[PDB]
């Protein structure tokens, strides 16, 4: 009756806590999160008594190298499931980066997927730097570009994570 498959969907450092219902009376969910090592669990008030099977914990898990936990308990008709916890979640490690969106005019302008750090009021580093992302531009067959910027010269792009040797899937084109 515990929430099932409780995990973080992590794309572009948007960390959606998600889960399945599990054995049955309609259920609601209470999402809690914490940084590994915290004794207390933070209640996710936006997802607290939710009938939703996911919970955006992005703001809550925006120290990207931080080990995070999310857990969900279900409650139906007064009875509460046990807390279903996620594995330890480290956005930095776990998150998947979408392709950059690529505009050409060639003048290729790569837009990183929307990344929560786009929003950080004060930045000491670019988003690409922050997220240690690279843009890779290819011309269907060769890597014509790799950098954290946008490039002077069919063309496709991806984001590479030098640190994890992870390349996003391809941009369109």
């Amino acid at each position: 009756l515990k929430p099932q498959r409780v995990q973080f969907q992590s794309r572009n450092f948007h960390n959606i806590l998600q889960w399945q219902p599990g054995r049955a009376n309609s259920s609601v969910y209470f999402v809690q999160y914490k940084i590994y090592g915290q004794r207390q669990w933070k209640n996710k008030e936006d997802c607290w008594g939710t009938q939703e099977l996911s919970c955006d914990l992005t703001s809550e898990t925006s120290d990207i190298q931080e080990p995070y936990y999310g857990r969900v308990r279900a409650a139906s008709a007064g009875s509460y499931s046990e807390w279903s916890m996620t594995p330890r979640f480290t956005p930095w490690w776990e998150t998947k980066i979408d392709p950059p969106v690529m505009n050409i005019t060639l003048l290729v302008i790569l837009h990183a997927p929307n990344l929560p750090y786009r929003y950080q009021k004060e930045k000491n580093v670019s988003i690409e730097d922050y997220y240690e992302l690279l843009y890779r531009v290819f011309i269907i067959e060769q890597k014509v570009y790799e950098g954290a910027h946008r490039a002077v010269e069919c063309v496709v792009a991806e984001i590479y994570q030098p640190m994890l040797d992870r390349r996003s899937q391809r941009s369109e084109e």
Partner: protein, 134 residues
């Protein structure tokens, strides 16, 4: 002095394996309330002294946990322990802090078998920290 080359922490293979290894290990780690390499580890430690601290942790980790448990969490273990061993060397050197390192050490021991688990589940942290500290 006390530092490592950025390049040490920019080998994606081992970086990955460290996280994969820490991830495996942490799957087995239920003490979410207890984090070895956490803020309270550096509590009282100047950013300057952080690396010596991390040197310390890394060594304890290596000697007390990773070397002994090198037989487990394969393949990652046999890949990551060496890497971390190397860092141990590069870092042999220096410049109390033990009151914190010991807290970590004593924690790992109190946690016993899950302390080894946790210690391994935190190699990514030891890594990340080692990096930021050096």
């Amino acid at each position: 002095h006390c530092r490592l080359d950025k390049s040490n922490f920019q080998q994606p293979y081992i970086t990955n394996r460290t996280f994969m290894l820490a991830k495996e290990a942490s799957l087995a780690d239920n003490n979410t309330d207890v984090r070895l390499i956490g803020e309270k580890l550096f509590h009282g430690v100047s950013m300057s002294e952080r690396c010596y601290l991390m040197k310390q942790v890394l060594n304890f980790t290596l000697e007390e946990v990773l070397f002994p448990q090198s037989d487990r969490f394969q393949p990652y273990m046999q890949e990551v322990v060496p890497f971390l061993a190397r860092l141990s060397n590069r870092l042999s050197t220096c410049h109390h802090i033990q009151r914190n390192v010991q807290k970590l050490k004593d924690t790992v021991k109190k946690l016993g078998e899950s302390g080894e688990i946790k210690a391994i589940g935190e190699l990514d942290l030891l890594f990340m920290s080692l990096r930021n500290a050096c």
